[PDB]
Amino acid sequence: GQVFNASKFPSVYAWERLRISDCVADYSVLYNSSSSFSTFKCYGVSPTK
Amino acid sequence: LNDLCFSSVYADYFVVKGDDVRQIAPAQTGVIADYNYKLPDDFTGCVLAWNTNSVDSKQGNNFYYRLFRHGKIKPYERDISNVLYNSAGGTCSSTSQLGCYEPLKSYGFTPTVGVGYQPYRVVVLSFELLNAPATVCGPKKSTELVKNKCVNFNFNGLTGTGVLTSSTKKFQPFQQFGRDVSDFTDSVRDPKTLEIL
Amino acid sequence: GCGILSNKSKPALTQYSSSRRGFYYFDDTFRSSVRVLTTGYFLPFNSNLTGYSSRNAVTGRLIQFDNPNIPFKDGLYFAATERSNVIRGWIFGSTLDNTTQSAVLFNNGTHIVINVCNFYFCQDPMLTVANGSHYKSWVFLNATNCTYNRVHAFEIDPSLNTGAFIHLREHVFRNVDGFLYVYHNYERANVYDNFPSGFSVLKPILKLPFGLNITQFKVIMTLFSPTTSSFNADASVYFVGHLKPLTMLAEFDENGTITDAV
Ligand SMILES: *[C@@H]1O[C@H](CO)[C@@H](O[C@@H]2O[C@H](CO)[C@@H](O[C@@H]3O[C@H](CO[C@H]4O[C@H](CO)[C@@H](O)[C@H](O)[C@@H]4O)[C@@H](O)[C@H](O[C@H]4O[C@H](CO)[C@@H](O)[C@H](O)[C@@H]4O[C@H]4O[C@H](CO)[C@@H](O)[C@H](O)[C@@H]4O)[C@@H]3O)[C@H](O)[C@H]2NC(C)=O)[C@H](O)[C@H]1NC(C)=O
Ligand SMILES: *[C@@H]1O[C@H](CO)[C@@H](O[C@@H]2O[C@H](CO)[C@@H](O[C@@H]3O[C@H](CO)[C@@H](O)[C@H](O[C@H]4O[C@H](CO)[C@@H](O)[C@H](O)[C@@H]4O)[C@@H]3O)[C@H](O)[C@H]2NC(C)=O)[C@H](O)[C@H]1NC(C)=O
Ligand SMILES: *[C@@H]1O[C@H](CO)[C@@H](O[C@@H]2O[C@H](CO)[C@@H](O)[C@H](O)[C@H]2NC(C)=O)[C@H](O)[C@H]1NC(C)=O
Ligand SMILES: *[C@@H]1O[C@H](CO)[C@@H](O[C@@H]2O[C@H](CO)[C@@H](O)[C@H](O)[C@H]2NC(C)=O)[C@H](O)[C@H]1NC(C)=O
Ligand SMILES: *[C@@H]1O[C@H](CO)[C@@H](O[C@@H]2O[C@H](CO)[C@@H](O)[C@H](O)[C@H]2NC(C)=O)[C@H](O)[C@H]1NC(C)=O
Ligand SMILES: *[C@@H]1O[C@H](CO)[C@@H](O[C@@H]2O[C@H](CO)[C@@H](O)[C@H](O)[C@H]2NC(C)=O)[C@H](O)[C@H]1NC(C)=O
Ligand SMILES: *[C@@H]1O[C@H](CO)[C@@H](O)[C@H](O)[C@H]1NC(C)=O
Ligand SMILES: *[C@@H]1O[C@H](CO)[C@@H](O)[C@H](O)[C@H]1NC(C)=O
Ligand SMILES: *[C@@H]1O[C@H](CO)[C@@H](O)[C@H](O)[C@H]1NC(C)=O
Ligand SMILES: *[C@@H]1O[C@H](CO)[C@@H](O)[C@H](O)[C@H]1NC(C)=O
Ligand SMILES: *[C@@H]1O[C@H](CO)[C@@H](O)[C@H](O)[C@H]1NC(C)=O
Ligand SMILES: *[C@@H]1O[C@H](CO)[C@@H](O)[C@H](O)[C@H]1NC(C)=O
């Protein structure tokens, strides 16, 4: 929610980085608490994994 | 597609919003892929979709998707039940008991909504290609049968080059072709004249 | 519109040996004069089958009408021995109530009926026969959102042969990719209360595009009585096993028939 539901994003020429740790990467929460993604492309791993 | 014959064809159809169209595929994740409609990894078929904002965005429309579920659906399953979802597990009532939600969520399909929230009609065509009688064939025209000459051929989409002669072999009631130990086709049933070559 | 069995005896749940039965055609591919090593869900050799039965009520014994909710898991093996076609069909579903859809498949007096609906089932679903003729069907009360309905021609002419079990029926049920697969075999038997040994191969008969989520299985049986003041049960026995992820060798003869398996 901190990144996906932020009140303000940076411009592309001056992008920001946030580190994520000590948490559960549950991506199903984004079904209720986030806008639908028009793009969701994984290169490293399959999104199902 | 126009050169093939299929032993079975099924058409699965429904309405989703634009942004959900990308989920209608093998190996996908998301609300639709997980809770509403799923295809197998070994999917044989075609997915078609088009924008119908001018038709399916009327005041009287009623389109829903499942938002809450315990677990995931299997490929080609349906679930049309409608009971309250208890996020703590088990069941609940009233919907005022804190952890109770309505399992279905409506699509806000208004005619003035931006692209990605507009309704799309999806049709999925599932195909089978077995050693069995064709039920659906493309718009091909047939020719005279030539025998004892090297020639190209196509029987219900089954192509190759060779010499066609009369067979003395017998086929099972629903056998269309036969193959030997090298998977070389040495016999075919003519689609119009019930004779093995 | 439901039959009532207020006092029923407990099931014996006797265990029987499956022998080498329960094998079925696992492919569409035509084969001949070849041995192939395959994998999938099959009934293990010499596996444990659970017996369930029907028994005529008498003064010293409560009616036995065994119809428990049996897990479907990854596939189910079903077989039965009968003298009068007591078993008519099965119910395939999850919660087996009107909350979700379920499939009801049974052979009635003149036709085989396959329906998928939200059913309000009877406590003890059954068919009734009287005066040498079919009387009524008491499987469910209400049915609403039906999505599948198919009727096949067939004839059932059940009677009292005051004998023993002369025929054995075998079925395999699998639910894969939205399709309910049914395999079938039929042979003569000469037993009273056991499971005939041997080896057999079942052939596919149905491939039904239900899109249903089967986790539970129930059996529909017929009661008999003239004058229809009350009904009783005849004697019948059915056996249930479960399919497991096994590796098996199968041999196809010159005509593509499976003659043996390991
Ligand atoms: C075909 O149709 C059937 C019927 O609808 C469907 O079955 C249902 O499957 C779902 C998903 O598995 C079941 O929902 C879960 O059930 C478990 C178990 O509860 C029952 O079984 C146990 C025995 O194992 C009994 O003791 C119990 O009394 C019930 O009878 C629940 O534990 C689940 O809730 C927990 O896990 C959820 C995870 O998603 C959490 O969201 C939820 O908050 C609960 O978690 C909490 O408790 C945990 C304790 O283990 C703890 O570890 C957590 O951190 C947290 O504190 C959930 O209710 C549903 O019950 C099944 N329905 C029936 C009638 O059995 C099939 O799945 C369907 N087929 C397909 C392919 O979908
Ligand atoms: C199977 O057939 C039956 C008919 O025999 C059919 O029943 C109908 O279901 C609809 C639900 O889609 C009912 O409409 C409801 O009416 C109540 C009024 O009390 C409304 O409150 C309901 O809306 C609530 O739930 C919505 C979520 O679905 C929320 O978005 C909304 O804000 C409300 O909280 C809803 O409009 C209709 O009344 C019944 N009809 C009858 C005769 O019972 C059933 O739906 C069919 N099954 C399927 C899968 O189609
Ligand atoms: C497919 O259509 C052809 C017509 O192009 C059928 O040809 C007939 O063949 C029989 C011999 O078996 C002749 O007696 C008829 O006169 C032919 N019909 C015509 C119009 O010439 C062919 O039999 C059909 N095959 C199948 C399986 O239906
Ligand atoms: C099939 O069922 C029989 C029961 O009749 C099982 O035999 C029992 O196995 C346990 C575990 O070794 C022993 O403690 C019991 O004493 C055995 N009972 C008898 C009567 O011998 C048998 O193991 C089961 N086989 C399978 C594959 O499940
Ligand atoms: C679904 O089944 C339930 C039963 O589990 C039905 O509720 C019963 O309705 C009868 C009247 O026909 C009452 O006599 C029972 O007391 C009710 N039982 C319970 C637990 O409420 C319910 O009406 C059925 N729903 C539908 C739509 O058929
Ligand atoms: C077996 O099932 C069939 C199919 O439902 C029954 O035949 C139908 O009976 C209704 C009247 O209740 C007619 O409106 C339908 O047209 C009949 N179907 C057909 C194909 O003719 C049949 O009566 C049932 N038999 C028994 C003994 O229950
Ligand atoms: C998330 O963003 C929406 C606007 O898109 C806002 O209305 C909502 O209040 C935000 N959630 C929280 C917890 O601030
Ligand atoms: C669904 O989203 C709402 C916010 O609109 C939130 O309050 C609710 O708790 C969410 N549902 C679940 C199960 O988290
Ligand atoms: C018959 O059912 C009743 C319950 O209504 C039970 O109390 C009684 O013991 C049962 N009879 C026998 C022989 O079990
Ligand atoms: C059925 O029984 C009655 C006597 O109750 C008899 O008259 C009738 O002929 C019998 N029907 C048949 C087919 O035997
Ligand atoms: C449901 O079944 C009951 C009989 O138990 C009947 O009275 C009722 O009218 C049926 N419902 C419908 C819609 O027919
Ligand atoms: C194959 O079928 C033929 C009949 O067409 C029969 O004569 C032959 O014995 C069968 N082969 C085997 C191994 O049974």
Side-chain angles (χ1 to χ4, degrees), chain A residues 1-6 8-20 23-27 29-32 37-40 42-49, chain B residues 1-7 9-28 30-43 45-53 56 58-61 63-76 78 80-90 92 97 99-109 111 113-140 142 145-164 169-180 182-186 188-192 194-197, chain C residues 1-5 7-8 11-31 33-37 40-53 56-57 60 62-80 83 85-101 103-109 111-132 134-135 138-143 145-149 152-154 156 158 163-165 167-189 194-196 198-224 226 231-235 237-253 255-262:
Chain A
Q2 182 177 9
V3 175
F4 288 97
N5 217 75
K8 183 176 179 180
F9 269 25
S11 295
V12 71
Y13 86 89
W15 54 273
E16 293 177 350
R17 170 170 285 182
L18 179 143
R19 170 143 192 71
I20 301 168
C23 64
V24 178
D26 186 344
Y27 293 98
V29 303
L30 296 172
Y31 295 177
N32 153 291
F37 297 107
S38 67
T39 297
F40 197 125
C42 295
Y43 299 91
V45 299
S46 175
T48 66
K49 300 291 193 180
Chain B
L1 289 169
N2 288 337
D3 293 313
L4 298 171
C5 288
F6 302 96
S7 63
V9 181
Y10 291 95
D12 296 347
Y13 57 95
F14 49 85
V15 176
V16 298
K17 64 179 180 180
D19 286 344
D20 289 334
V21 172
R22 69 177 175 81
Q23 290 178 48
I24 311 304
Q28 300 299 304
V31 296
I32 302 305
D34 296 319
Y35 302 153
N36 293 270
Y37 182 78
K38 184 172 177 68
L39 298 174
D41 288 339
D42 52 322
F43 174 66
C46 299
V47 179
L48 297 90
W50 66 103
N51 187 305
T52 56
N53 189 62
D56 292 327
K58 306 299 186 187
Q59 186 65 51
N61 62 7
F63 293 100
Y64 295 83
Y65 67 95
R66 188 175 298 279
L67 177 59
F68 299 105
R69 184 179 180 87
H70 295 291
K72 296 183 178 181
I73 65 169
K74 295 180 179 180
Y76 297 120
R78 286 178 285 199
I80 62 167
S81 69
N82 190 19
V83 300
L84 292 173
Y85 173 82
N86 187 341
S87 64
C92 68
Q97 296 180 324
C100 295
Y101 304 87
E102 293 289 353
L104 302 177
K105 180 75 175 177
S106 178
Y107 282 110
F109 287 148
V113 78
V115 174
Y117 293 100
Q118 294 178 3
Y120 283 69
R121 287 189 181 189
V122 180
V123 178
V124 180
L125 302 174
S126 296
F127 299 137
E128 294 185 350
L129 298 166
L130 304 174
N131 193 342
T135 63
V136 179
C137 288
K140 300 287 286 192
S142 294
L145 180 63
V146 173
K147 292 180 179 182
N148 313 342
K149 283 84 234 305
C150 187
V151 288
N152 300 324
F153 57 81
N154 180 323
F155 295 85
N156 301 323
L158 183 59
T159 71
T161 299
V163 178
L164 298 164
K169 297 175 185 61
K170 261 84 204 284
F171 275 16
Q172 295 295 300
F174 305 114
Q175 182 174 6
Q176 301 303 301
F177 62 91
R179 292 173 172 179
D180 71 27
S182 64
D183 285 322
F184 176 58
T185 302
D186 63 15
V188 301
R189 183 189 287 278
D190 185 279
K192 293 179 179 179
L194 296 183
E195 170 176 343
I196 304 303
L197 305 180
Chain C
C2 293
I4 307 298
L5 304 176
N7 273 89
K8 297 209 299 182
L13 307 179
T14 298
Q15 301 297 298
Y16 299 85
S17 166
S18 71
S19 190
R20 298 177 66 198
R21 294 177 176 274
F23 202 70
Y24 63 91
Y25 283 87
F26 51 87
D27 201 341
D28 297 302
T29 299
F30 285 92
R31 292 185 174 88
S33 298
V34 65
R35 290 178 294 278
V36 300
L37 184 66
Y41 289 85
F42 299 97
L43 189 69
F45 285 180
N46 291 331
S47 68
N48 271 324
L49 302 177
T50 300
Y52 305 88
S53 65
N56 193 311
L62 299 180
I63 195 166
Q64 187 170 347
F65 198 75
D66 292 336
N67 59 356
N69 296 317
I70 299 167
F72 192 77
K73 300 189 180 182
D74 295 319
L76 184 144
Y77 172 78
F78 191 87
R83 77 174 143 215
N85 310 309
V86 172
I87 297 165
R88 300 293 174 86
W90 316 275
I91 301 167
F92 299 90
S94 61
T95 59
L96 302 178
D97 63 10
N98 57 34
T99 299
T100 70
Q101 291 183 310
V104 180
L105 285 86
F106 69 104
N107 186 22
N108 97 353
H111 294 79
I112 296 167
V113 179
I114 301 170
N115 284 306
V116 182
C117 312
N118 291 321
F119 289 103
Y120 180 14
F121 286 117
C122 294
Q123 184 64 53
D124 290 291
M126 64 181 73
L127 276 79
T128 53
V129 176
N131 210 133
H134 301 282
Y135 179 60
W138 294 340
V139 176
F140 64 91
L141 294 170
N142 309 84
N145 324 80
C146 295
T147 59
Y148 192 88
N149 184 351
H152 293 274
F154 200 77
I156 179 166
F165 302 147
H167 288 292
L168 172 65
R169 291 176 182 276
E170 301 174 317
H171 296 84
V172 172
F173 301 105
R174 291 171 58 249
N175 188 29
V176 179
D177 296 343
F179 288 93
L180 177 63
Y181 294 84
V182 183
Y183 302 85
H184 166 269
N185 193 18
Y186 184 63
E187 67 179 70
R188 187 179 295 279
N194 215 318
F195 184 70
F199 169 80
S200 65
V201 181
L202 280 55
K203 293 179 179 180
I205 57 167
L206 300 168
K207 182 179 174 184
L208 309 168
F210 291 169
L212 185 65
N213 163 45
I214 302 163
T215 64
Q216 297 290 330
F217 171 82
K218 184 178 286 196
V219 181
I220 300 168
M221 291 175 279
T222 298
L223 301 182
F224 284 82
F231 289 89
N232 209 327
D234 199 348
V237 180
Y238 67 88
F239 309 85
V240 180
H242 297 270
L243 306 181
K244 299 296 183 181
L246 305 174
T247 300
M248 297 189 73
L249 181 69
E251 181 174 72
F252 292 80
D253 72 6
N255 294 346
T257 297
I258 299 166
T259 62
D260 201 353
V262 176

Short mmCIF file of all heavy atoms in Angstrom, two decimals, chain C residues 40-77, unseen atoms left out:
data_model
loop_
_atom_site.label_atom_id
_atom_site.label_comp_id
_atom_site.label_asym_id
_atom_site.label_seq_id
_atom_site.Cartn_x
_atom_site.Cartn_y
_atom_site.Cartn_z
N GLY C 40 -0.30 -42.63 -14.39
CA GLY C 40 -1.58 -41.96 -14.18
C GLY C 40 -2.30 -42.54 -12.99
O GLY C 40 -1.71 -43.23 -12.17
N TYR C 41 -3.59 -42.24 -12.87
CA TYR C 41 -4.35 -42.70 -11.73
C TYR C 41 -5.07 -44.01 -12.01
O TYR C 41 -5.99 -44.07 -12.81
CB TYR C 41 -5.32 -41.61 -11.28
CG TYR C 41 -4.62 -40.45 -10.63
CD1 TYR C 41 -4.10 -39.43 -11.41
CD2 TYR C 41 -4.49 -40.41 -9.26
CE1 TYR C 41 -3.45 -38.38 -10.81
CE2 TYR C 41 -3.83 -39.35 -8.67
CZ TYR C 41 -3.32 -38.34 -9.44
OH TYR C 41 -2.67 -37.29 -8.84
N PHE C 42 -4.61 -45.05 -11.33
CA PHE C 42 -5.12 -46.40 -11.52
C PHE C 42 -5.36 -47.06 -10.17
O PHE C 42 -4.78 -46.66 -9.16
CB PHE C 42 -4.14 -47.27 -12.32
CG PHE C 42 -3.85 -46.78 -13.71
CD1 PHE C 42 -2.72 -46.02 -13.97
CD2 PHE C 42 -4.70 -47.08 -14.77
CE1 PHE C 42 -2.44 -45.58 -15.25
CE2 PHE C 42 -4.42 -46.64 -16.04
CZ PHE C 42 -3.29 -45.89 -16.28
N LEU C 43 -6.21 -48.07 -10.15
CA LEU C 43 -6.42 -48.86 -8.94
C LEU C 43 -5.25 -49.83 -8.79
O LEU C 43 -4.98 -50.59 -9.72
CB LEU C 43 -7.75 -49.63 -9.05
CG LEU C 43 -8.25 -50.34 -7.79
CD1 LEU C 43 -8.68 -49.32 -6.75
CD2 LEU C 43 -9.41 -51.24 -8.17
N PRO C 44 -4.52 -49.82 -7.66
CA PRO C 44 -3.39 -50.69 -7.38
C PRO C 44 -3.82 -52.15 -7.37
O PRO C 44 -4.96 -52.45 -7.01
CB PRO C 44 -2.95 -50.25 -5.98
CG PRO C 44 -3.53 -48.87 -5.79
CD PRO C 44 -4.80 -48.84 -6.61
N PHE C 45 -2.92 -53.05 -7.74
CA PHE C 45 -3.24 -54.47 -7.67
C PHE C 45 -3.30 -54.93 -6.22
O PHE C 45 -2.52 -54.48 -5.38
CB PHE C 45 -2.23 -55.30 -8.46
CG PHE C 45 -2.37 -55.24 -9.97
CD1 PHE C 45 -1.51 -55.96 -10.78
CD2 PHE C 45 -3.37 -54.49 -10.59
CE1 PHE C 45 -1.62 -55.93 -12.15
CE2 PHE C 45 -3.48 -54.46 -11.97
CZ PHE C 45 -2.61 -55.18 -12.75
N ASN C 46 -4.26 -55.80 -5.93
CA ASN C 46 -4.50 -56.29 -4.58
C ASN C 46 -4.70 -55.15 -3.59
O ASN C 46 -4.24 -55.21 -2.45
CB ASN C 46 -3.38 -57.22 -4.13
CG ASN C 46 -3.38 -58.52 -4.88
OD1 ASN C 46 -4.43 -58.98 -5.34
ND2 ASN C 46 -2.23 -59.12 -5.01
N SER C 47 -5.43 -54.12 -4.02
CA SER C 47 -5.76 -53.00 -3.15
C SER C 47 -6.95 -53.36 -2.27
O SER C 47 -7.62 -54.37 -2.51
CB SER C 47 -6.06 -51.76 -3.97
OG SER C 47 -7.24 -51.90 -4.70
N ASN C 48 -7.21 -52.52 -1.25
CA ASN C 48 -8.33 -52.71 -0.34
C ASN C 48 -9.57 -51.95 -0.83
O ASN C 48 -9.56 -50.73 -0.95
CB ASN C 48 -7.96 -52.22 1.08
CG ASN C 48 -7.33 -53.30 1.94
OD1 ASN C 48 -7.72 -54.48 1.86
ND2 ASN C 48 -6.38 -52.91 2.77
N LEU C 49 -10.66 -52.70 -1.08
CA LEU C 49 -11.95 -52.13 -1.45
C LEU C 49 -12.88 -52.19 -0.25
O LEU C 49 -12.91 -53.19 0.47
CB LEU C 49 -12.60 -52.91 -2.60
CG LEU C 49 -11.81 -53.02 -3.90
CD1 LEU C 49 -12.58 -53.89 -4.88
CD2 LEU C 49 -11.58 -51.63 -4.48
N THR C 50 -13.66 -51.14 -0.04
CA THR C 50 -14.61 -51.14 1.07
C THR C 50 -15.98 -51.55 0.57
O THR C 50 -16.48 -51.03 -0.43
CB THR C 50 -14.69 -49.76 1.74
OG1 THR C 50 -13.40 -49.41 2.26
CG2 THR C 50 -15.69 -49.80 2.89
N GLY C 51 -16.59 -52.52 1.25
CA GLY C 51 -17.91 -52.99 0.86
C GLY C 51 -19.02 -52.26 1.60
O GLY C 51 -18.95 -52.03 2.81
N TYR C 52 -20.08 -51.97 0.86
CA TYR C 52 -21.30 -51.36 1.36
C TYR C 52 -22.45 -52.17 0.80
O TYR C 52 -22.33 -52.75 -0.29
CB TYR C 52 -21.40 -49.91 0.91
CG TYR C 52 -20.21 -49.03 1.26
CD1 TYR C 52 -19.14 -48.95 0.39
CD2 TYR C 52 -20.20 -48.29 2.43
CE1 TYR C 52 -18.07 -48.15 0.68
CE2 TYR C 52 -19.12 -47.49 2.72
CZ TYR C 52 -18.05 -47.42 1.85
OH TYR C 52 -16.97 -46.62 2.15
N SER C 53 -23.56 -52.26 1.51
CA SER C 53 -24.62 -53.14 1.03
C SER C 53 -26.04 -52.69 1.35
O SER C 53 -26.27 -51.76 2.13
CB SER C 53 -24.40 -54.53 1.58
OG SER C 53 -24.54 -54.55 2.97
N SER C 54 -26.98 -53.38 0.73
CA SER C 54 -28.40 -53.21 0.97
C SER C 54 -28.98 -54.53 1.46
O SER C 54 -28.67 -55.59 0.92
CB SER C 54 -29.10 -52.78 -0.31
N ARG C 55 -29.79 -54.47 2.51
CA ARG C 55 -30.39 -55.69 3.06
C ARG C 55 -31.85 -55.50 3.41
O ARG C 55 -32.25 -54.49 3.98
CB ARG C 55 -29.64 -56.16 4.30
N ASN C 56 -32.64 -56.53 3.12
CA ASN C 56 -34.06 -56.56 3.41
C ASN C 56 -34.30 -56.51 4.92
O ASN C 56 -33.70 -57.27 5.68
CB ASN C 56 -34.70 -57.79 2.79
CG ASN C 56 -36.20 -57.75 2.77
OD1 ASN C 56 -36.84 -57.45 3.78
ND2 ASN C 56 -36.77 -58.04 1.62
N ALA C 57 -35.16 -55.59 5.35
CA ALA C 57 -35.48 -55.44 6.77
C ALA C 57 -36.33 -56.60 7.25
O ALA C 57 -37.28 -57.00 6.58
CB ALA C 57 -36.22 -54.13 7.01
N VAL C 58 -36.00 -57.10 8.43
CA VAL C 58 -36.76 -58.17 9.07
C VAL C 58 -37.03 -57.82 10.52
O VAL C 58 -36.47 -56.86 11.04
CB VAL C 58 -36.01 -59.52 8.95
N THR C 59 -37.86 -58.60 11.18
CA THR C 59 -38.23 -58.31 12.56
C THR C 59 -37.01 -58.07 13.45
O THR C 59 -37.03 -57.18 14.31
CB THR C 59 -39.08 -59.45 13.16
N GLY C 60 -35.97 -58.87 13.29
CA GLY C 60 -34.80 -58.80 14.16
C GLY C 60 -33.66 -57.95 13.60
O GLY C 60 -32.55 -57.97 14.14
N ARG C 61 -33.90 -57.23 12.51
CA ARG C 61 -32.84 -56.44 11.88
C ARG C 61 -33.38 -55.20 11.18
O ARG C 61 -34.30 -55.28 10.36
CB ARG C 61 -32.08 -57.30 10.87
N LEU C 62 -32.75 -54.06 11.45
CA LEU C 62 -33.16 -52.81 10.81
C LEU C 62 -32.75 -52.80 9.35
O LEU C 62 -31.77 -53.44 8.97
CB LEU C 62 -32.51 -51.61 11.51
CG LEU C 62 -32.85 -51.40 13.00
CD1 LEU C 62 -32.12 -50.16 13.49
CD2 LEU C 62 -34.35 -51.28 13.19
N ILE C 63 -33.48 -52.05 8.53
CA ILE C 63 -33.18 -51.99 7.11
C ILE C 63 -31.76 -51.50 6.90
O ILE C 63 -31.31 -50.56 7.57
CB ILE C 63 -34.16 -51.06 6.35
CG1 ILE C 63 -34.04 -51.31 4.83
CG2 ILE C 63 -33.86 -49.59 6.68
CD1 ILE C 63 -35.17 -50.72 4.01
N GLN C 64 -31.05 -52.12 5.98
CA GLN C 64 -29.70 -51.68 5.68
C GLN C 64 -29.68 -50.99 4.33
O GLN C 64 -29.93 -51.61 3.30
CB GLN C 64 -28.71 -52.83 5.71
CG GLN C 64 -27.26 -52.40 5.56
CD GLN C 64 -26.30 -53.52 5.84
OE1 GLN C 64 -26.67 -54.57 6.37
NE2 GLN C 64 -25.04 -53.32 5.48
N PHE C 65 -29.42 -49.70 4.35
CA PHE C 65 -29.42 -48.88 3.15
C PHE C 65 -28.17 -48.02 3.17
O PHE C 65 -28.21 -46.87 3.59
CB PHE C 65 -30.68 -48.02 3.13
CG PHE C 65 -31.06 -47.45 1.79
CD1 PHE C 65 -31.63 -48.25 0.83
CD2 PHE C 65 -30.87 -46.11 1.51
CE1 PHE C 65 -32.01 -47.73 -0.39
CE2 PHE C 65 -31.25 -45.58 0.29
CZ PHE C 65 -31.82 -46.40 -0.66
N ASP C 66 -27.04 -48.60 2.75
CA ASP C 66 -25.77 -47.92 2.89
C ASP C 66 -25.57 -46.88 1.80
O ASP C 66 -25.39 -47.21 0.63
CB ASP C 66 -24.61 -48.92 2.87
CG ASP C 66 -24.58 -49.84 4.09
OD1 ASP C 66 -25.11 -49.48 5.11
OD2 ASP C 66 -24.03 -50.92 3.98
N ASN C 67 -25.60 -45.61 2.20
CA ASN C 67 -25.46 -44.50 1.28
C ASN C 67 -24.74 -43.30 1.91
O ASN C 67 -25.30 -42.21 1.97
CB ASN C 67 -26.83 -44.09 0.77
CG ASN C 67 -27.76 -43.69 1.88
OD1 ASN C 67 -27.42 -43.79 3.06
ND2 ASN C 67 -28.93 -43.25 1.52
N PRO C 68 -23.51 -43.50 2.40
CA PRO C 68 -22.65 -42.51 3.03
C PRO C 68 -22.06 -41.56 2.00
O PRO C 68 -22.05 -41.87 0.81
CB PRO C 68 -21.56 -43.38 3.67
CG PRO C 68 -21.49 -44.60 2.77
CD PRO C 68 -22.92 -44.85 2.34
N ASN C 69 -21.53 -40.44 2.47
CA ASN C 69 -20.83 -39.51 1.60
C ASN C 69 -19.38 -39.95 1.42
O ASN C 69 -18.59 -39.93 2.36
CB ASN C 69 -20.88 -38.10 2.15
CG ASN C 69 -22.27 -37.55 2.20
OD1 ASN C 69 -23.05 -37.71 1.26
ND2 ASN C 69 -22.59 -36.89 3.28
N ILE C 70 -19.05 -40.39 0.21
CA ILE C 70 -17.74 -40.95 -0.09
C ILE C 70 -16.87 -39.93 -0.83
O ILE C 70 -17.29 -39.40 -1.85
CB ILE C 70 -17.90 -42.22 -0.94
CG1 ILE C 70 -18.70 -43.27 -0.15
CG2 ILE C 70 -16.53 -42.75 -1.34
CD1 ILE C 70 -19.18 -44.43 -0.98
N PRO C 71 -15.67 -39.63 -0.33
CA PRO C 71 -14.69 -38.76 -0.95
C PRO C 71 -14.38 -39.20 -2.37
O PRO C 71 -14.24 -40.39 -2.63
CB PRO C 71 -13.48 -38.94 -0.03
CG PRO C 71 -14.07 -39.29 1.31
CD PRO C 71 -15.29 -40.13 0.99
N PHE C 72 -14.26 -38.24 -3.28
CA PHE C 72 -13.96 -38.54 -4.67
C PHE C 72 -12.46 -38.50 -4.92
O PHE C 72 -11.94 -39.21 -5.79
CB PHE C 72 -14.67 -37.55 -5.59
CG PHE C 72 -14.64 -37.93 -7.03
CD1 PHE C 72 -15.48 -38.92 -7.51
CD2 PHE C 72 -13.78 -37.30 -7.91
CE1 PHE C 72 -15.47 -39.27 -8.84
CE2 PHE C 72 -13.77 -37.65 -9.24
CZ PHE C 72 -14.61 -38.63 -9.71
N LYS C 73 -11.77 -37.66 -4.17
CA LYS C 73 -10.32 -37.48 -4.28
C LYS C 73 -9.87 -37.28 -5.72
O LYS C 73 -10.31 -36.34 -6.39
CB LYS C 73 -9.60 -38.67 -3.64
CG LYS C 73 -9.92 -38.86 -2.16
CD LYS C 73 -9.02 -39.90 -1.52
CE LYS C 73 -9.34 -40.07 -0.04
NZ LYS C 73 -8.44 -41.05 0.62
N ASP C 74 -8.97 -38.14 -6.20
CA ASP C 74 -8.39 -37.99 -7.53
C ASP C 74 -8.99 -38.96 -8.53
O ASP C 74 -8.47 -39.15 -9.63
CB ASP C 74 -6.87 -38.20 -7.47
CG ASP C 74 -6.14 -37.13 -6.67
OD1 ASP C 74 -6.50 -35.98 -6.78
OD2 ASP C 74 -5.24 -37.48 -5.94
N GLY C 75 -10.10 -39.57 -8.15
CA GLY C 75 -10.77 -40.54 -9.01
C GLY C 75 -11.29 -41.70 -8.17
O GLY C 75 -10.73 -42.02 -7.12
N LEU C 76 -12.36 -42.32 -8.64
CA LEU C 76 -13.01 -43.36 -7.86
C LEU C 76 -13.30 -44.62 -8.67
O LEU C 76 -13.77 -44.54 -9.81
CB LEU C 76 -14.30 -42.77 -7.27
CG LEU C 76 -15.12 -43.66 -6.33
CD1 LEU C 76 -15.72 -42.79 -5.23
CD2 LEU C 76 -16.23 -44.34 -7.11
N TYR C 77 -13.04 -45.77 -8.07
CA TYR C 77 -13.41 -47.06 -8.67
C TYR C 77 -14.66 -47.60 -8.02
O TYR C 77 -14.74 -47.70 -6.79
CB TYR C 77 -12.28 -48.08 -8.54
CG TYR C 77 -12.69 -49.48 -8.97
CD1 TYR C 77 -12.76 -49.80 -10.32
CD2 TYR C 77 -13.00 -50.43 -8.02
CE1 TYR C 77 -13.14 -51.06 -10.71
CE2 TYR C 77 -13.38 -51.70 -8.41
CZ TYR C 77 -13.45 -52.01 -9.75
OH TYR C 77 -13.82 -53.26 -10.15
#
